[PDB]
Amino acid sequence: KVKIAVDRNPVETSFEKWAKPGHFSRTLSKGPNTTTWIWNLHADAHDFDSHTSDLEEISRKVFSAHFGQLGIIFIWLSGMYFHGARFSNYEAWLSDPTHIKPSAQVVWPIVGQEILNGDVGGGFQGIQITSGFFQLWRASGITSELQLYTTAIGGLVMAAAMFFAGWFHYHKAAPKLEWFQNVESMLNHHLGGLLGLGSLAWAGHQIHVSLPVNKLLDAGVDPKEIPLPHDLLLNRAIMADLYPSFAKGIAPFFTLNWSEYSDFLTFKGGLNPVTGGLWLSDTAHHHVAIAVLFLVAGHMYRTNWGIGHSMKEILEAHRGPFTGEGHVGLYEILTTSWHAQLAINLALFGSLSIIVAHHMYAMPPYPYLATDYGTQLSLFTHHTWIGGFCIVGAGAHAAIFMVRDYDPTNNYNNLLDRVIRHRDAIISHLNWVCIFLGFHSFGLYIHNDTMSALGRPQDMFSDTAIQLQPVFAQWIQNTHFLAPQLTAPNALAATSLTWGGDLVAVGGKVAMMPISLGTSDFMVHHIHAFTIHVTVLILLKGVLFARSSRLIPDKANLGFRFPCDGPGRGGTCQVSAWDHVFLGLFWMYNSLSIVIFHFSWKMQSDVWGTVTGVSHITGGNFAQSANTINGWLRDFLWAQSSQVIQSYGSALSAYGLIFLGAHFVWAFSLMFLFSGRGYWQELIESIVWAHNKLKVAPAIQPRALSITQGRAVGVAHYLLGGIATTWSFFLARIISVG
Amino acid sequence: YAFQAIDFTTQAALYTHHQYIAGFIMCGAFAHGAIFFIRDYDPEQNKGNVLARMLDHKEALISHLSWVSLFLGFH
Amino acid sequence: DIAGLTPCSESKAYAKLEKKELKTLEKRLKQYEADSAPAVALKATMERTKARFANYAKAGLLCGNDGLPHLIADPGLALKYGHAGEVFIPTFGFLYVAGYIGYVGRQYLIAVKGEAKPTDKEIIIDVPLATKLAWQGAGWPLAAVQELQRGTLLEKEENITVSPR
Amino acid sequence: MKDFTTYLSTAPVIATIWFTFTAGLLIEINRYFPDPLVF
Amino acid sequence: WTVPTLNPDTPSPIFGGSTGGLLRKAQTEEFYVITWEAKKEQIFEMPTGGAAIMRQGPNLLKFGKKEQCLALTTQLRNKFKLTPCFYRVFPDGKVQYLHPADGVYPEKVNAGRVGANQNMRRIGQNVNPIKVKFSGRMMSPAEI
Amino acid sequence: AHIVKIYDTCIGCTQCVRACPLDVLEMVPWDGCKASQMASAPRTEDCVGCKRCETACPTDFLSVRVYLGSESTRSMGLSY
Amino acid sequence: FLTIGPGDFLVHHAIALGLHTTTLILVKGALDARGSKLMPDKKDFGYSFPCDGPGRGGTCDISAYDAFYLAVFWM
Amino acid sequence: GPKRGSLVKILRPESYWFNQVGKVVSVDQSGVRYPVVVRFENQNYAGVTTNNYALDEVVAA
Ligand code: CLA
Ligand code: CLA
Ligand code: CLA
Ligand code: CLA
Ligand code: CLA
Ligand code: CLA
Ligand code: CLA
Ligand SMILES: CC1=C(/C=C/C(C)=C/C=C/C(C)=C/C=C/C=C(C)/C=C/C=C(C)/C=C/C2=C(C)CCCC2(C)C)C(C)(C)CCC1
Ligand code: SF4
Ligand code: SF4
Ligand code: SF4
């Protein structure tokens, strides 16, 4: 029986526990004796497993926490809309998108920082934004600042509702454990109601507001002169003036004569040629199809009536001869362990974000987006980074499950058990394939460097010497370009210009052209494969050996996060799964930095540029230069950092400052990464003596950071430094040459 | 030497060479001084002289080196 | 003057840099309307630029061969040639405020060590006692030299040391 | 209310209030007295 | 109490076979063999990875190092309240009993034990490294 | 083999014994402390030098000390 | 005797920073080689030992050799 | 030796609380080598606030 189950008034709303730091932990509620306490207080603040053993209380805590997160995000969205309405040039940009730079941040005139308010056009001065909100707002049909202001107030109201919902569902009416364990009902409601009704209501908004307003905006009529959306809902005769299908109403829908809705539910493909974005009619049909699909999908699992599937029965039904008991026991694991769920959801959520990056660069969904090169670079890079971080998190929480929640006396000869039982074979094969990939992928680059340096270019791996053509990718590309003719008859064009074909340009700039693939693309793709495989190796090794290894047979009893097991047995530093997350973080940074460099150079070289033929931003140097390390060093890094290094005295000077600052923070991380806390503790001893001499020794004893906190501080400053460096480089480059 | 300082690459190479040689040799001086303290220092054969009185005020030494390092770095 | 430096009111590269910055600001200015907000902002920027160059030439700063103000850090040379307001008066101003902060922190520590929970006062600040010591710390150099002369500024050799001292 | 002022007496809250006061005082000084290099 | 003997014909726990098992150290140098008597049939965690069903009665497992046998001993002793003992086996067939070599577990005092490696002084009363220079080898001053 | 020493500041709390993952230490009769128990290291040939014993000891300073000496196949923790 | 100015000022104070910091690490390695409060019997392990384990908060890079190691970066 | 509750001072040079002040808990009257039990208000690097000392390692100061 699926029903609402709630306990009344569990936790009194009181300011008492605000005044007692570390109340949540029996160890930390004793008070601070040394400085380590503070760090512990913040590190274990949200580790609810270390607070209680009771799954119900933990579940309630995570529920209200999620509400807090949603309220924060709503505050953030409210801020973006309010700043877009009050401190922007959005209307001016609407009147001239091709020659006005999107700006929605202005600085105050103090200490000379006023110079950052640059000439972005439209009679405005501010910081040019690259988040892409302007294109999203134009695509949604927003025309005035008033509507943005109203959206800001609405989002603030929703933030207040989310914080009230958090307080309410923790302190007043907090759900019971068997409410949270209704996973079949949760999937039904989220697949129907969330994704399904979400895309249904959005398709409603599109068909009724987006399509007419953007059709008029593409027609050329002044935005203020375009009818307001409520007049588009109210008087259907205007909707019939743009698309005569609307004259017949919803009569073709119920009578199944859906073909008459082909005015606004299309299958054109390609891009809008005057606008450089996907057709909103294609997007409307897409969201209608997505809606119907998800609402069908949301009626799959049995709840309070006989019909519907059961998750444990589907899992226990798939058993073979090679795997033994198969998927038995997995339902119990995924309905009692939050960390397993978090690992799965983080992996797929990160992967999904990377897919979002690729599909949004390749098939520009917003108008005047493809030619806002800064926005495209920013969006791709951003969502790729977010993706990578969520994948590393997935590996982390997988390992946390493996140490804290794994219990083999309910999990005995299972898929998980066999994985743990042949982990040596898995890791050794992954090891070998990583070394193989490293040798041949990186070795081609080193080979080319040597041959080019020795004056023998005919012996290189290139398009003119020893060729290594991406035959398979070229074949898939050609097939997808020829797809509208035979295997997709109702498609007018291909799904993306990059497959092949003509060229769509807007305002003299290239929106998208066919992307060619040669030896350089072969080499970078195998570099990507190598780095990804190594990252998977580290993380997977971390999760498979989290409990035990031949080195530490009882590693599980030492916890998930611990520094080592002493200098014996040769040395056991970084044996914990946490340390494997730490190394996977560095390798994830490596991989995604090479990925975004690939994207940046390739787009600036073979795609972007002006139309007179097409003059590219870097003239097409990718195909001959991206085969040597010196080529990346000179033609990419050195050449394209001109803009960042000479940005002083202009509006881009902040990117130079953050270039230097990011380099500094990156180097600053090396002190934590390369050293150890014994030295620092002894140094602190001397300093403590000096403070004792002058009666200024604190009652809370100064302690050097822990080993694991030294590693954490190290990797955090390392990531912040490197990522912010590439951020400043990218933004200054693409804003100046864009 | 004659027609040195008109060969500029020679100037840069010789200066950089002997400066890095000097840096490694100074770090080795302090390293073998620590090795002296660990292996060869007898405190009973040095009861009250200058070398034991350096170990007696070592916290003031390390504290004032810490102060000049922090001052020069911050400013 | 000092070290072969010309005064900034006499330096030519100083006036050249002033004219160059005004030229950059008016090249940014000449692409707007007359009474618009970017025009008002850039005219306020030009006003502050002219006022800043007039104030630096007024104060008797020394410029180099590039037209930039140079500072003199020697007490007697700056007191002799009238450059005391750039290092000497700033260094005694800094020593006043830095010793203020240090003396207020030291008095807070000695005030909270005499209780049953010194660490609990270190985490959660006694705000009335902190404000009382913050207002009383204006006579910190007098109280500092008085604690120096009584021998109560220093702890004796009851400090923590290592076995070879 | 006693516990709310005890929470406001904690270290990061007071550090936030005090650095907001100090930074705002420096910002108002650099506004009304633009660009001081000497004196 | 007398020193027990190894029965090689003791039934092993129910286990499908891991990749973390023995290596050539078992054939060339040594391998260690653990034995306990169980009260009921119950799943335990193998220290080399995976789950295993123990049999009701005597059990027998062989590991590669001593720490694996201590980890299984600690698991079977703190979680299941059992009394195991693990041996040392050479490829000749030589059997060396240990843990508990006294018969009583070392976490409680028993008469008859002789104290080994006990310095009867403080740690601050060690000599300086100048006093032990130029011996036959490296010496820490705590060796004397 | 590593060097493990026991010093007379031992208070026979048995913490070091229950911390060793290799069964090297044991408690012997003694008369130097109220607990009438002292640690002893009769099996230092199997010691790897992990120093869990030193972590478990409450006394200040340590009453058990591990001096990492010459490595063997047992002290390196090798299963191969 | 090259003509000098405020860049030469800033770089000579950066040089003083580097020298005093490297001297801090090297002198602190020479003097805390006999032992510190975190490790009073450091003379009993020698000059170059890995660590003393994760106990007492963790003791990584506690030997005088490790102070040399950390000071070569500053050199 | 010293009495319960009295303040003493530690002269063991390889101790964390050398040249510092603690409080006597008890003195064992047997032939134990380190009978003086002294608690300290601050903990060492191992988180311990109690140590045993000899008679010539404590001074009631
Ligand atoms: C406004 C009235 C109010 C009051 C008096 C309380 C009081 C309490 N809550 Mg409740 N609760 C409330 C509203 C309130 N809550 C709201 C709005 C939510 C949804 C978030 C919750 C959800 C909730 C959960 C899940 C839990 C509590 C718990 C508690 C108890 C202890 C928590 C504590 O003392 O730390 C106080 C914490 C803070 C003062 C810090 C707030 C952190 C904010 C939310 C994060 C956002 C800051 C933001 C990111 C800015 C950062 C900028 C930059 C520097 C990064 C205490 C009785 C806990 C409990 O009962 O344990 C037994 C517990 O587990 N509350
Ligand atoms: C959520 C993200 C977000 C971000 C990053 C920004 C960022 C900015 N805003 Mg925007 N804004 C936002 C959302 C955001 N805003 C929202 C949701 C609204 C509607 C309420 C606004 C309405 C708004 C206006 C009207 C203005 C800005 C302005 C600014 C700029 C300067 C802010 C400043 O100096 O304030 C002043 C600084 C302070 C008030 C510091 C005091 C902080 C206190 C002391 C902390 C105390 C700690 C306490 C426990 C926690 C806070 C509790 C809280 C209830 C007070 C800065 C770019 C200004 C601007 O753009 O100028 C051109 C401006 O005029 N914002
Ligand atoms: C069809 C109804 C429905 C909808 C739309 C949702 C939607 C959501 N649930 Mg789910 N939930 C449902 C039924 C539903 N739930 C049922 C029946 C159960 C019990 C089996 C759960 C148990 C559950 C748990 C344990 C959690 C969620 C969470 C979430 C949020 C995921 C965050 C996100 O990406 O959304 C995008 C964000 C939005 C779309 C914002 C709009 C949200 C508003 C409130 C509309 C959603 C409708 C809402 C359910 C109606 C509430 C009415 C209320 C006044 C009584 C999302 C808002 C997670 C969460 O974040 O909690 C805070 C979470 O931890 N749900
Ligand atoms: C999912 C979101 C969504 C929403 C909200 C709408 C809404 C609408 N569509 Mg649209 N439509 C959609 C998706 C959506 N559509 C999609 C996906 C397609 C493609 C197939 C279309 C294709 C389409 C066409 C071709 C047309 C519409 C039309 C309409 C309008 C009239 C429909 C109607 O008569 O419904 C039936 C009436 C109701 C459902 C009434 C609602 C119930 C009321 C509010 C209850 C009130 C009760 C309360 C007690 C009384 C108030 C008391 C209070 C005052 C105190 C309406 C604004 C028509 C139009 O006007 O175009 C401009 C039209 O011609 N739609
Ligand atoms: C650029 C510096 C650098 C290099 C060369 C390496 C190299 C490697 N890392 Mg390392 N790593 C690095 C930075 C680097 N890493 C940093 C900064 C960290 C700290 C975050 C790590 C942390 C780390 C982790 C966690 C892991 C690695 C692993 C590896 C190995 C991957 C396997 C492989 O591809 O073999 C191929 C070898 C190469 C690509 C090296 C260059 C080979 C040249 C080009 C050809 C060799 C022929 C040569 C010229 C002949 C010389 C003859 C001469 C001697 C006479 C590889 C040796 C992984 C591993 O070992 O698992 C498989 C692993 O898991 N590293
Ligand atoms: C560029 C990288 C970098 C930087 C900045 C430092 C800086 C320092 N090192 Mg480190 N070191 C480094 C690399 C670096 N090191 C590397 C690669 C190693 C090899 C592992 C070491 C090994 C090492 C040793 C062995 C020692 C040092 C010491 C020091 C300190 C020397 C005294 C000083 O100059 O204080 C000036 C302070 C700075 C230059 C740091 C900047 C502080 C900023 C300006 C303050 C905060 C600003 C802002 C408000 C923060 C906002 C952040 C926001 C999130 C809140 C200084 C903090 C020594 C020490 O501790 O002496 C006391 C010491 O013994 N370092
Ligand atoms: C940090 C170290 C330092 C250094 C290297 C200098 C360097 C100098 N001082 Mg300055 N000074 C300093 C700190 C320093 N000062 C401090 C802390 C004070 C306050 C006590 C002064 C107060 C002061 C006065 C009143 C005068 C100088 C003067 C000078 C210049 C020549 C002095 C000389 O020839 O004697 C050798 C240098 C030293 C012994 C270094 C210490 C300087 C002492 C404190 C003063 C020496 C003054 C000198 C006897 C008078 C020379 C008269 C001149 C006409 C020949 C020289 C550039 C003189 C000047 O203006 O020349 C143009 C001068 O009249 N200084
Ligand atoms: C200017 C001039 C002058 C002067 C000069 C002088 C006076 C100089 C000085 C110089 C000096 C004054 C130098 C010194 C240096 C030093 C050093 C550089 C040191 C180092 C040290 C060390 C390295 C240590 C070591 C050790 C240890 C650690 C332990 C114990 C042992 C030993 C001791 C070995 C004249 C008059 C001629 C004339 C005019 C010009
Ligand atoms: S302390 Fe640092 S170094 Fe010594 S073992 Fe533990 S981790 Fe490795
Ligand atoms: S060694 Fe440390 S722990 Fe083991 S008994 Fe003696 S005192 Fe108790
Ligand atoms: S080091 Fe490892 S083995 Fe040697 S004693 Fe301490 S714990 Fe037992």
mmCIF file with all atom_site columns, N, CA, C and O in Angstrom, chain A residues 32 37 114 119 125 689 692-693 695 697-700, chain C residues 28 31-32 38 45 48 113 119 122-123 152 154-155 160:
data_model
loop_
_atom_site.group_PDB
_atom_site.id
_atom_site.type_symbol
_atom_site.label_atom_id
_atom_site.label_alt_id
_atom_site.label_comp_id
_atom_site.label_asym_id
_atom_site.label_entity_id
_atom_site.label_seq_id
_atom_site.pdbx_PDB_ins_code
_atom_site.Cartn_x
_atom_site.Cartn_y
_atom_site.Cartn_z
_atom_site.occupancy
_atom_site.B_iso_or_equiv
_atom_site.pdbx_formal_charge
_atom_site.auth_seq_id
_atom_site.auth_comp_id
_atom_site.auth_asym_id
_atom_site.auth_atom_id
_atom_site.pdbx_PDB_model_num
ATOM 1   N N  . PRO A 1 32  ? 35.770 22.841 21.501  1.00 0.00 ? 32  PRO A N  1
ATOM 2   C CA . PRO A 1 32  ? 37.076 22.859 20.827  1.00 0.00 ? 32  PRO A CA 1
ATOM 3   C C  . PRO A 1 32  ? 38.228 22.862 21.817  1.00 0.00 ? 32  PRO A C  1
ATOM 4   O O  . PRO A 1 32  ? 38.299 23.698 22.721  1.00 0.00 ? 32  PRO A O  1
ATOM 5   N N  . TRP A 1 37  ? 39.392 20.683 15.409  1.00 0.00 ? 37  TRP A N  1
ATOM 6   C CA . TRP A 1 37  ? 37.958 20.729 15.694  1.00 0.00 ? 37  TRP A CA 1
ATOM 7   C C  . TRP A 1 37  ? 37.153 21.538 14.671  1.00 0.00 ? 37  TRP A C  1
ATOM 8   O O  . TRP A 1 37  ? 36.102 21.073 14.233  1.00 0.00 ? 37  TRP A O  1
ATOM 9   N N  . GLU A 1 114 ? 35.753 51.083 -12.605 1.00 0.00 ? 114 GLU A N  1
ATOM 10  C CA . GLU A 1 114 ? 34.788 51.578 -13.587 1.00 0.00 ? 114 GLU A CA 1
ATOM 11  C C  . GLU A 1 114 ? 35.184 51.261 -15.027 1.00 0.00 ? 114 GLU A C  1
ATOM 12  O O  . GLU A 1 114 ? 34.313 51.199 -15.899 1.00 0.00 ? 114 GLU A O  1
ATOM 13  N N  . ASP A 1 119 ? 32.401 49.341 -23.602 1.00 0.00 ? 119 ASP A N  1
ATOM 14  C CA . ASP A 1 119 ? 31.467 49.702 -24.666 1.00 0.00 ? 119 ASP A CA 1
ATOM 15  C C  . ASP A 1 119 ? 30.903 48.443 -25.311 1.00 0.00 ? 119 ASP A C  1
ATOM 16  O O  . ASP A 1 119 ? 31.444 47.918 -26.283 1.00 0.00 ? 119 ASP A O  1
ATOM 17  N N  . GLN A 1 125 ? 27.021 50.573 -20.796 1.00 0.00 ? 125 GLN A N  1
ATOM 18  C CA . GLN A 1 125 ? 28.371 50.247 -20.359 1.00 0.00 ? 125 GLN A CA 1
ATOM 19  C C  . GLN A 1 125 ? 28.294 49.217 -19.247 1.00 0.00 ? 125 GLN A C  1
ATOM 20  O O  . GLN A 1 125 ? 27.703 49.476 -18.195 1.00 0.00 ? 125 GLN A O  1
ATOM 21  N N  . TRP A 1 689 ? 55.767 28.904 20.588  1.00 0.00 ? 689 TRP A N  1
ATOM 22  C CA . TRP A 1 689 ? 56.722 29.378 21.599  1.00 0.00 ? 689 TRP A CA 1
ATOM 23  C C  . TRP A 1 689 ? 56.798 30.899 21.592  1.00 0.00 ? 689 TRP A C  1
ATOM 24  O O  . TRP A 1 689 ? 56.797 31.535 22.653  1.00 0.00 ? 689 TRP A O  1
ATOM 25  N N  . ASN A 1 692 ? 53.819 32.305 23.150  1.00 0.00 ? 692 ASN A N  1
ATOM 26  C CA . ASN A 1 692 ? 53.874 32.091 24.593  1.00 0.00 ? 692 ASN A CA 1
ATOM 27  C C  . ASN A 1 692 ? 54.755 33.125 25.274  1.00 0.00 ? 692 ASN A C  1
ATOM 28  O O  . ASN A 1 692 ? 54.464 33.549 26.397  1.00 0.00 ? 692 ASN A O  1
ATOM 29  N N  . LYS A 1 693 ? 55.886 33.464 24.643  1.00 0.00 ? 693 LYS A N  1
ATOM 30  C CA . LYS A 1 693 ? 56.808 34.470 25.171  1.00 0.00 ? 693 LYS A CA 1
ATOM 31  C C  . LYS A 1 693 ? 56.134 35.825 25.404  1.00 0.00 ? 693 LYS A C  1
ATOM 32  O O  . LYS A 1 693 ? 56.497 36.542 26.344  1.00 0.00 ? 693 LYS A O  1
ATOM 33  N N  . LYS A 1 695 ? 52.676 36.177 25.877  1.00 0.00 ? 695 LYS A N  1
ATOM 34  C CA . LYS A 1 695 ? 51.370 35.926 26.506  1.00 0.00 ? 695 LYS A CA 1
ATOM 35  C C  . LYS A 1 695 ? 50.202 36.039 25.523  1.00 0.00 ? 695 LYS A C  1
ATOM 36  O O  . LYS A 1 695 ? 49.119 36.509 25.872  1.00 0.00 ? 695 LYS A O  1
ATOM 37  N N  . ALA A 1 697 ? 49.404 33.237 23.462  1.00 0.00 ? 697 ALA A N  1
ATOM 38  C CA . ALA A 1 697 ? 49.109 31.892 22.984  1.00 0.00 ? 697 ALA A CA 1
ATOM 39  C C  . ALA A 1 697 ? 47.621 31.604 23.152  1.00 0.00 ? 697 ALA A C  1
ATOM 40  O O  . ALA A 1 697 ? 47.081 31.792 24.244  1.00 0.00 ? 697 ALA A O  1
ATOM 41  N N  . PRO A 1 698 ? 46.933 31.171 22.097  1.00 0.00 ? 698 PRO A N  1
ATOM 42  C CA . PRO A 1 698 ? 45.489 30.941 22.191  1.00 0.00 ? 698 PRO A CA 1
ATOM 43  C C  . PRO A 1 698 ? 45.148 29.718 23.021  1.00 0.00 ? 698 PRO A C  1
ATOM 44  O O  . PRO A 1 698 ? 45.946 28.788 23.164  1.00 0.00 ? 698 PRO A O  1
ATOM 45  N N  . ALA A 1 699 ? 43.947 29.746 23.597  1.00 0.00 ? 699 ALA A N  1
ATOM 46  C CA . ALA A 1 699 ? 43.474 28.608 24.375  1.00 0.00 ? 699 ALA A CA 1
ATOM 47  C C  . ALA A 1 699 ? 43.138 27.421 23.479  1.00 0.00 ? 699 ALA A C  1
ATOM 48  O O  . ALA A 1 699 ? 43.223 26.269 23.917  1.00 0.00 ? 699 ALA A O  1
ATOM 49  N N  . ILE A 1 700 ? 42.757 27.684 22.233  1.00 0.00 ? 700 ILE A N  1
ATOM 50  C CA . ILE A 1 700 ? 42.539 26.640 21.237  1.00 0.00 ? 700 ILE A CA 1
ATOM 51  C C  . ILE A 1 700 ? 43.870 26.387 20.532  1.00 0.00 ? 700 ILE A C  1
ATOM 52  O O  . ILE A 1 700 ? 44.353 27.237 19.781  1.00 0.00 ? 700 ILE A O  1
ATOM 53  N N  . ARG C 2 28  ? 36.986 57.197 -25.930 1.00 0.00 ? 28  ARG C N  1
ATOM 54  C CA . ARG C 2 28  ? 35.842 56.401 -25.494 1.00 0.00 ? 28  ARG C CA 1
ATOM 55  C C  . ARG C 2 28  ? 34.587 57.263 -25.334 1.00 0.00 ? 28  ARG C C  1
ATOM 56  O O  . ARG C 2 28  ? 33.470 56.768 -25.516 1.00 0.00 ? 28  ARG C O  1
ATOM 57  N N  . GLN C 2 31  ? 31.714 58.524 -28.683 1.00 0.00 ? 31  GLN C N  1
ATOM 58  C CA . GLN C 2 31  ? 30.779 57.625 -29.349 1.00 0.00 ? 31  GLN C CA 1
ATOM 59  C C  . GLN C 2 31  ? 29.476 57.482 -28.565 1.00 0.00 ? 31  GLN C C  1
ATOM 60  O O  . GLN C 2 31  ? 28.801 56.454 -28.647 1.00 0.00 ? 31  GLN C O  1
ATOM 61  N N  . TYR C 2 32  ? 29.102 58.518 -27.818 1.00 0.00 ? 32  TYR C N  1
ATOM 62  C CA . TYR C 2 32  ? 27.840 58.525 -27.090 1.00 0.00 ? 32  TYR C CA 1
ATOM 63  C C  . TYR C 2 32  ? 27.087 59.827 -27.325 1.00 0.00 ? 32  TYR C C  1
ATOM 64  O O  . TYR C 2 32  ? 27.534 60.680 -28.097 1.00 0.00 ? 32  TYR C O  1
ATOM 65  N N  . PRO C 2 38  ? 26.398 57.046 -19.903 1.00 0.00 ? 38  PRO C N  1
ATOM 66  C CA . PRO C 2 38  ? 27.827 56.786 -20.157 1.00 0.00 ? 38  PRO C CA 1
ATOM 67  C C  . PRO C 2 38  ? 28.652 58.046 -20.341 1.00 0.00 ? 38  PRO C C  1
ATOM 68  O O  . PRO C 2 38  ? 29.817 58.079 -19.926 1.00 0.00 ? 38  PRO C O  1
ATOM 69  N N  . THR C 2 45  ? 34.904 60.419 -14.784 1.00 0.00 ? 45  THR C N  1
ATOM 70  C CA . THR C 2 45  ? 36.210 59.764 -14.841 1.00 0.00 ? 45  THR C CA 1
ATOM 71  C C  . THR C 2 45  ? 37.312 60.743 -15.242 1.00 0.00 ? 45  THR C C  1
ATOM 72  O O  . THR C 2 45  ? 38.391 60.756 -14.636 1.00 0.00 ? 45  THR C O  1
ATOM 73  N N  . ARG C 2 48  ? 37.979 63.133 -12.288 1.00 0.00 ? 48  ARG C N  1
ATOM 74  C CA . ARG C 2 48  ? 38.822 62.498 -11.275 1.00 0.00 ? 48  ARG C CA 1
ATOM 75  C C  . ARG C 2 48  ? 40.258 62.323 -11.750 1.00 0.00 ? 48  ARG C C  1
ATOM 76  O O  . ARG C 2 48  ? 41.183 62.427 -10.940 1.00 0.00 ? 48  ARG C O  1
ATOM 77  N N  . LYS C 2 113 ? 41.404 34.058 29.462  1.00 0.00 ? 113 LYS C N  1
ATOM 78  C CA . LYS C 2 113 ? 42.094 32.922 30.073  1.00 0.00 ? 113 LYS C CA 1
ATOM 79  C C  . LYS C 2 113 ? 41.722 32.718 31.536  1.00 0.00 ? 113 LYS C C  1
ATOM 80  O O  . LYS C 2 113 ? 41.908 31.615 32.058  1.00 0.00 ? 113 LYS C O  1
ATOM 81  N N  . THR C 2 119 ? 38.485 28.449 25.860  1.00 0.00 ? 119 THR C N  1
ATOM 82  C CA . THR C 2 119 ? 38.237 28.056 24.482  1.00 0.00 ? 119 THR C CA 1
ATOM 83  C C  . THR C 2 119 ? 36.816 28.385 24.053  1.00 0.00 ? 119 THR C C  1
ATOM 84  O O  . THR C 2 119 ? 36.597 28.746 22.892  1.00 0.00 ? 119 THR C O  1
ATOM 85  N N  . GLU C 2 122 ? 36.822 31.752 23.107  1.00 0.00 ? 122 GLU C N  1
ATOM 86  C CA . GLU C 2 122 ? 37.550 31.921 21.858  1.00 0.00 ? 122 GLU C CA 1
ATOM 87  C C  . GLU C 2 122 ? 36.704 31.575 20.639  1.00 0.00 ? 122 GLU C C  1
ATOM 88  O O  . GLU C 2 122 ? 36.831 32.232 19.598  1.00 0.00 ? 122 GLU C O  1
ATOM 89  N N  . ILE C 2 123 ? 35.826 30.576 20.745  1.00 0.00 ? 123 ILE C N  1
ATOM 90  C CA . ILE C 2 123 ? 34.916 30.270 19.640  1.00 0.00 ? 123 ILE C CA 1
ATOM 91  C C  . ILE C 2 123 ? 33.770 31.278 19.570  1.00 0.00 ? 123 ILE C C  1
ATOM 92  O O  . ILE C 2 123 ? 33.494 31.845 18.507  1.00 0.00 ? 123 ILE C O  1
ATOM 93  N N  . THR C 2 152 ? 55.927 42.611 33.082  1.00 0.00 ? 152 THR C N  1
ATOM 94  C CA . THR C 2 152 ? 54.714 41.834 32.888  1.00 0.00 ? 152 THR C CA 1
ATOM 95  C C  . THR C 2 152 ? 54.354 41.678 31.420  1.00 0.00 ? 152 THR C C  1
ATOM 96  O O  . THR C 2 152 ? 53.354 41.023 31.107  1.00 0.00 ? 152 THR C O  1
ATOM 97  N N  . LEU C 2 154 ? 56.359 40.097 29.357  1.00 0.00 ? 154 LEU C N  1
ATOM 98  C CA . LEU C 2 154 ? 56.970 38.833 28.985  1.00 0.00 ? 154 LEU C CA 1
ATOM 99  C C  . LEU C 2 154 ? 56.557 37.728 29.938  1.00 0.00 ? 154 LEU C C  1
ATOM 100 O O  . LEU C 2 154 ? 56.378 37.957 31.137  1.00 0.00 ? 154 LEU C O  1
ATOM 101 N N  . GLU C 2 155 ? 56.419 36.529 29.390  1.00 0.00 ? 155 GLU C N  1
ATOM 102 C CA . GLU C 2 155 ? 56.417 35.323 30.194  1.00 0.00 ? 155 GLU C CA 1
ATOM 103 C C  . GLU C 2 155 ? 57.862 34.926 30.478  1.00 0.00 ? 155 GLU C C  1
ATOM 104 O O  . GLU C 2 155 ? 58.756 35.135 29.654  1.00 0.00 ? 155 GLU C O  1
ATOM 105 N N  . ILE C 2 160 ? 57.015 26.355 26.879  1.00 0.00 ? 160 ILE C N  1
ATOM 106 C CA . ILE C 2 160 ? 57.171 24.996 26.380  1.00 0.00 ? 160 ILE C CA 1
ATOM 107 C C  . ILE C 2 160 ? 58.371 24.936 25.439  1.00 0.00 ? 160 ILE C C  1
ATOM 108 O O  . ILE C 2 160 ? 58.505 25.747 24.515  1.00 0.00 ? 160 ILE C O  1
#
